[PDB]
Write an enzyme that holds these catalytic residues in place. Structure first.
Site, PDB file in Angstrom:
ATOM      1  N   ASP A  48      -7.840   6.647 -14.168  1.00  0.00           N
ATOM      2  CA  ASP A  48      -8.557   7.134 -13.914  1.00  0.00           C
ATOM      3  C   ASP A  48      -9.124   7.404 -12.721  1.00  0.00           C
ATOM      4  O   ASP A  48      -9.922   7.118 -11.873  1.00  0.00           O
ATOM      5  CB  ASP A  48     -10.150   6.322 -14.825  1.00  0.00           C
ATOM      6  CG  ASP A  48     -11.131   7.416 -15.398  1.00  0.00           C
ATOM      7  OD1 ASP A  48     -11.349   8.501 -14.510  1.00  0.00           O
ATOM      8  OD2 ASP A  48     -12.206   7.464 -16.394  1.00  0.00           O
ATOM      9  N   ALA A  65     -17.341   9.865 -23.318  1.00  0.00           N
ATOM     10  CA  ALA A  65     -17.688  10.951 -22.219  1.00  0.00           C
ATOM     11  C   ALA A  65     -16.385  11.561 -21.451  1.00  0.00           C
ATOM     12  O   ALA A  65     -16.318  12.684 -20.860  1.00  0.00           O
ATOM     13  CB  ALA A  65     -19.319  10.119 -21.014  1.00  0.00           C
ATOM     14  N   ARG A  98     -12.790  -1.324 -16.722  1.00  0.00           N
ATOM     15  CA  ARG A  98     -13.244  -0.095 -17.748  1.00  0.00           C
ATOM     16  C   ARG A  98     -11.391   0.662 -17.128  1.00  0.00           C
ATOM     17  O   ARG A  98     -11.247   1.418 -17.944  1.00  0.00           O
ATOM     18  CB  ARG A  98     -14.527   0.524 -17.904  1.00  0.00           C
ATOM     19  CG  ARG A  98     -14.873   1.376 -16.899  1.00  0.00           C
ATOM     20  CD  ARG A  98     -15.939   2.347 -16.767  1.00  0.00           C
ATOM     21  NE  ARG A  98     -15.867   3.155 -16.294  1.00  0.00           N
ATOM     22  CZ  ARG A  98     -17.283   2.548 -14.806  1.00  0.00           C
ATOM     23  NH1 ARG A  98     -17.675   0.914 -14.736  1.00  0.00           N
ATOM     24  NH2 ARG A  98     -17.034   2.791 -13.769  1.00  0.00           N
ATOM     25  N   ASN A  99     -11.306   0.860 -15.717  1.00  0.00           N
ATOM     26  CA  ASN A  99     -10.204   1.692 -15.871  1.00  0.00           C
ATOM     27  C   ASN A  99      -8.886   1.329 -15.240  1.00  0.00           C
ATOM     28  O   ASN A  99      -7.913   1.735 -14.516  1.00  0.00           O
ATOM     29  CB  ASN A  99     -10.528   2.951 -14.644  1.00  0.00           C
ATOM     30  CG  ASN A  99     -11.429   3.464 -15.119  1.00  0.00           C
ATOM     31  OD1 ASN A  99     -12.026   3.907 -16.354  1.00  0.00           O
ATOM     32  ND2 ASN A  99     -13.269   4.061 -14.110  1.00  0.00           N
ATOM     33  N   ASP A 114     -13.783   5.002  -8.534  1.00  0.00           N
ATOM     34  CA  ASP A 114     -14.369   4.374  -9.379  1.00  0.00           C
ATOM     35  C   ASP A 114     -13.205   3.021 -10.214  1.00  0.00           C
ATOM     36  O   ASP A 114     -13.043   3.074 -11.423  1.00  0.00           O
ATOM     37  CB  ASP A 114     -14.148   5.684 -11.146  1.00  0.00           C
ATOM     38  CG  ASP A 114     -14.656   5.624 -12.420  1.00  0.00           C
ATOM     39  OD1 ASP A 114     -15.976   4.824 -12.311  1.00  0.00           O
ATOM     40  OD2 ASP A 114     -14.712   6.274 -12.474  1.00  0.00           O
TER      41      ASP A 114
HETATM   42  C1  LIG Z   1      -9.767   2.691 -22.689  1.00  0.00           C
HETATM   43  C2  LIG Z   1      -9.131   3.476 -22.240  1.00  0.00           C
HETATM   44  C3  LIG Z   1      -8.344   4.132 -23.874  1.00  0.00           C
HETATM   45  C4  LIG Z   1      -9.091   5.150 -24.569  1.00  0.00           C
HETATM   46  N1  LIG Z   1      -6.721   3.748 -24.408  1.00  0.00           N
HETATM   47  C5  LIG Z   1      -5.793   4.026 -24.469  1.00  0.00           C
HETATM   48  C6  LIG Z   1      -5.379   4.091 -23.877  1.00  0.00           C
HETATM   49  C7  LIG Z   1      -4.068   4.869 -23.141  1.00  0.00           C
HETATM   50  N2  LIG Z   1      -2.820   4.988 -22.311  1.00  0.00           N
HETATM   51  C8  LIG Z   1      -3.754   5.143 -21.355  1.00  0.00           C
HETATM   52  C9  LIG Z   1      -2.611   5.678 -20.029  1.00  0.00           C
HETATM   53  C10 LIG Z   1      -2.982   5.710 -18.621  1.00  0.00           C
HETATM   54  N3  LIG Z   1      -4.583   6.538 -18.631  1.00  0.00           N
HETATM   55  C11 LIG Z   1      -5.091   6.592 -19.596  1.00  0.00           C
HETATM   56  C12 LIG Z   1      -7.236   7.140 -19.204  1.00  0.00           C
HETATM   57  C13 LIG Z   1      -7.150   8.335 -18.600  1.00  0.00           C
HETATM   58  N4  LIG Z   1      -8.652   8.217 -18.578  1.00  0.00           N
HETATM   59  N5  LIG Z   1      -9.158   6.777 -19.524  1.00  0.00           N
HETATM   60  S1  LIG Z   1     -10.257   7.496 -20.333  1.00  0.00           S
HETATM   61  O1  LIG Z   1     -10.557   6.649 -21.085  1.00  0.00           O
HETATM   62  O2  LIG Z   1     -10.842   8.507 -19.567  1.00  0.00           O
HETATM   63  C14 LIG Z   1     -10.632   5.520 -19.612  1.00  0.00           C
HETATM   64  C15 LIG Z   1     -11.466   4.299 -20.047  1.00  0.00           C
HETATM   65  C16 LIG Z   1     -12.164   5.238 -19.348  1.00  0.00           C
HETATM   66  C17 LIG Z   1      -7.490   6.519 -19.810  1.00  0.00           C
HETATM   67  N6  LIG Z   1      -5.064   6.160 -20.915  1.00  0.00           N
HETATM   68  N7  LIG Z   1      -3.325   3.722 -23.942  1.00  0.00           N
HETATM   69  C18 LIG Z   1      -3.732   2.684 -24.932  1.00  0.00           C
HETATM   70  C19 LIG Z   1      -5.314   2.309 -25.613  1.00  0.00           C
HETATM   71  C20 LIG Z   1      -5.835   2.015 -26.314  1.00  0.00           C
HETATM   72  O3  LIG Z   1      -6.736   2.293 -26.779  1.00  0.00           O
HETATM   73  N8  LIG Z   1      -4.234   0.945 -26.474  1.00  0.00           N
HETATM   74  C21 LIG Z   1      -5.509   0.445 -27.584  1.00  0.00           C
HETATM   75  C22 LIG Z   1      -4.666  -0.084 -29.673  1.00  0.00           C
HETATM   76  C23 LIG Z   1      -2.849   0.933 -28.845  1.00  0.00           C
HETATM   77  F1  LIG Z   1      -2.227   0.809 -30.432  1.00  0.00           F
HETATM   78  F2  LIG Z   1      -3.256   2.139 -28.227  1.00  0.00           F
END
Ligand SMILES: CC[C@H](C)Nc1cc(Nc2ccnc(-c3cnn(S(=O)(=O)C4CC4)c3)n2)ncc1C(=O)NCCC(F)F
Ligand SMILES: [Cl-]
Length: 299
Positions: free
Chosen positions: A159, A29, A145-146, A141
């Site tokens: 987030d 989402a 998770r964030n 928020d």
């Molecule tokens: C869980 C969030 C996302 C899917 N995962 C990452 C995000 C980032 N960086 C950043 C830096 C600042 N802001 C964001 C940000 C802003 N909004 N959101 S969001 O998704 O809306 C939020 C979850 C609802 C994420 N993200 N770095 C790494 C991963 C990762 O998956 N690492 C594991 C494997 C490795 F190989 F990477």
């Protein structure tokens, strides 16, 4: 200046050719997040990045408000925007957080997480939040998770899609005044901090698991709160309960939460009781020119 001070943050615009997408990290989402490398041209430097997309004009409006907020923050426990790319879909270029979300981290390493780590994560989130309060910014928020994990020793809040100056909504993390009246202060973020701490101390349990969100307003009005996690002493739970007071001003300020959790962090086994706390330990490219975003600074 008639009210707020002028925001002199630089919005850095990045070329598509400067960065390489490697794989999809997540999709939902919130949007689509990709792993990638940013190679700023000229400099012998490679920067591990997360690239966020989401297509529609209302969607570009929402993500550019998020870009505005992330561009304007500079604290070790808050994620900053490195830049934006202006392709057909607007991309947010962010720091790669290798260990992912703190919610997913606590669930995956339930058997390896000690009291020192849990209490230090509480300190760091409080520092991040107090900084946002110094910048007069209500997150709206805050949840596990964030909070993202740079290393097991180093977490950051992210987030800013709901972040504002002082349809769907995260009811189970929200203060009562926010559900009933849409009132959002720094002290409503403190309620959410309490729920965030509860998630960490339960190793990522869903708050009010099974309860529908329409019933939550009456539940909280009756006086019911989230139960005391098994590992929590009364000392730690009392701090969580204090975050969930009806009166907003009666809740702890984030500066006080830093103090209290950092006192507890100097003697972690006094405040969190975990079975086998002591033995627990934690951690394709040419990597020579790799530099993490925290070490890549700009004039
Ligand atoms: C869980 C969030 C996302 C899917 N995962 C990452 C995000 C980032 N960086 C950043 C830096 C600042 N802001 C964001 C940000 C802003 N909004 N959101 S969001 O998704 O809306 C939020 C979850 C609802 C994420 N993200 N770095 C790494 C991963 C990762 O998956 N690492 C594991 C494997 C490795 F190989 F990477
Ligand atoms: Cl600001």
């Amino acid at each position: 200046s008639m009210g707020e001070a002028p925001n002199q943050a630089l919005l850095r615009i990045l070329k598509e050719t400067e960065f390489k997408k490697i794989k999809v990290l997540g999709s939902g989402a919130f949007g689509t997040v990709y792993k990638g490398l940013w190679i700023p041209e000229g400099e012998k430097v490679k920067i591990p990045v997360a690239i966020k997309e989401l297509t529609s004009p209302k969607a570009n409006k929402e993500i550019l408000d998020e870009a505005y907020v992330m561009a304007s923050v500079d604290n070790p426990h808050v994620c900053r925007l490195l830049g934006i790319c202006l392709t057909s879909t607007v991309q947010l270029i962010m720091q790669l957080m290798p260990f992912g979300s703190l919610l997913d981290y606590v669930r995956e390493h339930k058997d390896n997480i000690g009291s020192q780590y849990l209490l230090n994560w509480c300190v760091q989130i409080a520092k991040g939040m107090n900084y946002l309060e110094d910048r007069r910014l209500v997150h709206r928020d805050l949840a596990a998770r964030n909070v993202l994990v740079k290393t097991p020793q180093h977490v950051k809040i992210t987030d800013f899609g709901r972040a504002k100056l002082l349809g769907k909504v995260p009811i189970k993390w929200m203060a009562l005044e926010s559900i009933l009246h849409r009132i959002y202060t720094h002290q409503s973020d403190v309620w959410s901090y309490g729920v965030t701490v509860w998630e960490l101390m339960t190793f990522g349990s869903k708050p009010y698991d099974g309860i529908p969100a329409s019933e939550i307003s009456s539940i909280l009005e009756k006086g019911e709160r989230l139960p005391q996690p098994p590992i929590c002493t009364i000392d730690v739970y009392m701090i969580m309960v204090k975050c969930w007071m009806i009166d907003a001003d009666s809740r702890p300020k984030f500066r006080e939460l830093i103090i209290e959790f950092s006192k507890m962090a100097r003697d972690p086994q006094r405040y969190l009781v975990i079975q086998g706390d002591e033995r627990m330990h934690l951690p394709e490219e040419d990597m020579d020119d790799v530099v993490d975003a925290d070490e890549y600074l700009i004039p």
